[PDB]
């Protein structure tokens, strides 16, 4: 009747902040490539700023008992309270641990939390403990429970640091209640069907032209427009879009018709949006709002709407299928339908018209994991190198 958190599940660790008497939900985040430290990503401002859950999702590999872990170190399981767990960062493939080196956040005793390549040692392992009197050691862990992770290495709880002006995550002797939200489970997923948080290409027309931004012009200002192109762009990196749902919990569930989502350009990091003048334009994460960056997939151009459909907690039912299914993008608020400008590789512009054209359906093609990782690395490298260049110029 009630789901239990088991191994091989993808989740996000959440914490509650009460800065200036404001209840804020935050997630444990880490950009594994490059900066090894862990930071906090806000999810309370999802209506105003998109959370980056791709670097917040973690995978639960193993849930061993304490003595079994001790024996192993000397040499689809369900989690139980008092078991040590290994959390793998989904994007990086690395494991959460205590770095044993502190940035001295006004606490000599506290230790930093980061990612480690090797599973060897007791630093990567964390022991989960109940927060409420209802749960006891040995009990199954409910999906909606508050948990307190304890590092085997330093015996320090995973802590939320209010002391510094910027909220930090560290291993401290004070305990913090962490909430585990189920993103997706790999076993329940259906192969070949669209799921949340998946990198894909939007293939349109007869030549299978893919929606893309202009090629590298050395200007992010010029790389902010959207158009249809065909050829090698379909195998290039600037034609990859990440579909991000507005819901935090079960964000990896099967995408259903009429479900709002945000389309993020992986290489540039900007979210697809509609301007006031009825023109598509990529926008920054700070300015990416629901009002402008919300889009839905619809089976047909029929005027009658799907209406309201209740979100279900779980994998859901697979409706949109890669390749076979034909989809039409409609803005959630304005109701406009994505269409080609029909002006004459092809370099045809993409606008949104309230009727559109009869040939406006596009297919979906899944992107390989290596290609998506490479595009994300390109993003994370170009951002840092642009910052370095601007600093050098200043």
């Amino acid at each position: 009747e009630i789901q239990f958190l088991r191994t091989d599940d993808e989740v996000v660790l959440q914490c509650t902040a009460t800065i200036h008497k404001e209840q804020q939900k935050l997630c444990l985040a880490a950009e594994g490539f490059g900066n090894r430290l862990c930071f906090l990503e806000s999810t309370s401002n999802s209506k105003n700023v998109p959370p980056d859950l791709s670097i917040c999702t973690f995978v639960l590999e193993q849930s061993l008992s304490v003595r079994a872990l001790q024996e192993m170190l000397a040499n689809h399981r369900t989690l139980l309270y008092g078991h040590a767990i290994l959390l793998r960062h989904s994007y990086s493939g690395m494991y959460l641990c205590c770095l044993s080196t502190s940035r001295s956040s006004t606490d000599k005793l506290a230790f930093d939390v980061g990612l480690q390549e090797d599973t060897t040692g007791e630093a990567c392992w964390w022991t989960i403990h109940p927060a409420s009197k209802q749960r006891s050691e040995g009990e199954k862990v409910r999906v909606g429970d508050d948990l307190i992770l304890v590092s085997v290495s330093s015996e320090r709880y995973l802590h939320l640091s209010y002391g510094n002006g910027s909220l930090h995550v560290d291993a401290a002797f004070q305990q913090t209640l962490w909430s585990v939200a189920p993103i997706s489970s790999g076993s329940e997923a259906a192969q070949g069907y669209l799921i949340g948080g998946d990198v894909l290409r939007l293939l349109h027309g007869h030549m299978d032209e893919c929606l893309t931004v202009p090629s590298g012009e050395h200007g992010e200002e010029q790389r902010r427009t959207v158009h249809y192109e065909g050829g090698a762009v379909s195998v290039h990196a600037r034609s990859l879009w990440r579909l991000e749902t507005l819901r935090v919990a079960w964000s990896g569930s099967h995408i259903r018709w009429g479900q709002p989502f945000r389309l993020r350009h992986v290489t540039t990091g900007k979210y697809l949006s509609l301007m006031e003048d009825k023109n598509l334009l990529l926008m920054d994460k700070e300015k990416a709002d629901v009002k402008s960056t919300a889009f839905t997939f619809r089976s047909s151009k029929e005027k009658l709407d799907v209406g309201v459909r209740k979100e279900v907690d779980g994998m859901g039912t697979s409706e949109i299928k890669y390749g076979d299914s034909v989809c039409y993008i409609q803005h959630v608020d304005t109701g406009l339908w994505l269409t080609y400008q029909s002006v004459d590789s092809i370099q045809r512009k993409a606008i949104m018209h309230h009727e559109g054209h009869m040939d406006d359906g596009i297919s979906l093609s899944r992107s390989q994991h290596e290609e998506s990782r490479t595009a994300r690395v390109i993003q994370s490298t170009v951002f840092l190198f642009n910052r370095f260049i601007r600093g050098l110029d200043a």
Binding site: T106, K108, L109, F111, S154, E155, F173
Partner: protein
């Protein structure tokens, strides 16, 4: 019990004191100077409207911090478990090391003591122990540093000796006058040294081998320890502890370094009193261990050979001991102990050694006198 206590103490960090709470904390050392300042300040130390009614708050703070340090050091795991590699023991020691930095311990050890002083009237003025910094506070820091961090590096050992241990030794030696010997401070400092510092330097004897660079520090340590041993108010256990410490240090020490100590030995051991027995053992052990240095023309390959001034020292040592034993009334134990020393010195001296017609010009009898040795 120690593993449970450490876990509970880190679960509730309030028990560590405001200095070690971790946020806005000045550290153990700065807490010690803050307590010292409170101790000299009359307002905070006293109630400010004879000991059961009056708490000295600064001394109470020092005692609390010393007790916490002592408890944590005693909670530190035994070294045999760490050598065997018990992960729990390693984790406990790492937690304690993170809790207490080594620099704070070194600073607190380097904190100086107030010396009782004689006045015009002839009465020693003595600062009351219930208010101020006391050697028992030092003892806890020493115990923590030994049990948790450990002394395994020659550089760290010599730095510690330079900063914190030698000043206390010299103060104890300077407090060896007849009037100041019976003072509370002298007794407390002697007890602290003989219980904590000297056994530490005795167990860290092998680290004293390669100390050619720091010759002056080792010479000063040896002379100060010897004068402290010559002191009178010492107890039997303290005197034995100093004997063992000096014998352990001198044995591992290189032959060339104790040249300055032999100069004071040759002037005191001919007296053949009760105080000369430890010099007898020291001379016997040294001249038995390092006879190659003196007898062989090449000597030890690494240490080398004598400068002929050490040879003159050994010659007059041998002759003084022999003549003093000849004129001395036969005491069986003293005459049984002196003979090994005499034989070792006789073996060490080359049988073809020239007695130096050019004696050392201006010998230091006047600077180094019979009473007060200076």
């Amino acid at each position: 019990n120690a593993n449970v206590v450490v876990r509970l103490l880190i679960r509730r960090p309030e028990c560590f004191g405001p200095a070690l709470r971790g946020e806005g904390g000045n550290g153990l050392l700065a807490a010690m100077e803050e307590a010292i300042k409170i101790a000299e300040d009359p307002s905070r130390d006293g109630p400010s409207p004879e000991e059961d009614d009056t708490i000295h708050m600064g001394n109470a703070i020092m005692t609390f911090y010393s007790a916490l340090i002592d408890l944590l050091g005693r909670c530190a795991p035994e070294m045999h478990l760490i050598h065997a590699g018990k992960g729990e023991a390693i984790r406990i020691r790492s937690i304690l090391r993170s809790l207490i930095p080594l620099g704070d311990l070194v600073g607190v050890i380097s904190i100086a003591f107030q010396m009782p002083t004689i006045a015009k009237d002839g009465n020693v003025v003595e600062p009351d122990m219930s208010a101020g910094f006391c050697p028992d506070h030092k003892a806890a820091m020493v115990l923590f540093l030994d049990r948790v961090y450990g002394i395994e590096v020659q550089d760290f050992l010599l730095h510690l000796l330079e900063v914190g241990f030698l000043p206390d030794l010299r103060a104890a030696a300077s407090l060896d006058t007849a009037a100041l010997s019976a003072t509370d401070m002298a007794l407390a400092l002697n007890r602290y040294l003989c219980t904590a510092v000297l056994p530490l330097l005795t167990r860290c004897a092998p680290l004293f081998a390669g100390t050619e660079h720091h010759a002056s520090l080792i010479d000063s340590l040896l002379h100060t320890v010897y004068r402290l041993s010559k002191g009178c108010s010492l107890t039997k256990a303290q005197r034995d502890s100093i004997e063992v410490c000096l014998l352990s240090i001198c044995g591992q020490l290189r032959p060339s370094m104790m040249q300055h100590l032999l100069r004071r030995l040759v002037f005191d051991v001919p007296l053949l009193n009760e105080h000369a027995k430890m010099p007898l053992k020291l001379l016997t052990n040294h001249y038995e261990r390092c006879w190659k240095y003196y007898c062989l023309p090449g000597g030890w390959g690494n240490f080398g050979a004598a400068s002929e001034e050490e040879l003159h020292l050994s010659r007059k040592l041998f002759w003084g001991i022999f003549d003093a034993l000849s004129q001395k009334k036969y005491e069986q134990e003293l005459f049984k102990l002196a003979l090994p020393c005499l034989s070792a010195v006789a073996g060490a001296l080359p049988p073809d050694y020239m007695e130096s017609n050019y004696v050392s010009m201006m010998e230091k009898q006047s600077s180094m006198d019979s009473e007060g040795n200076f």
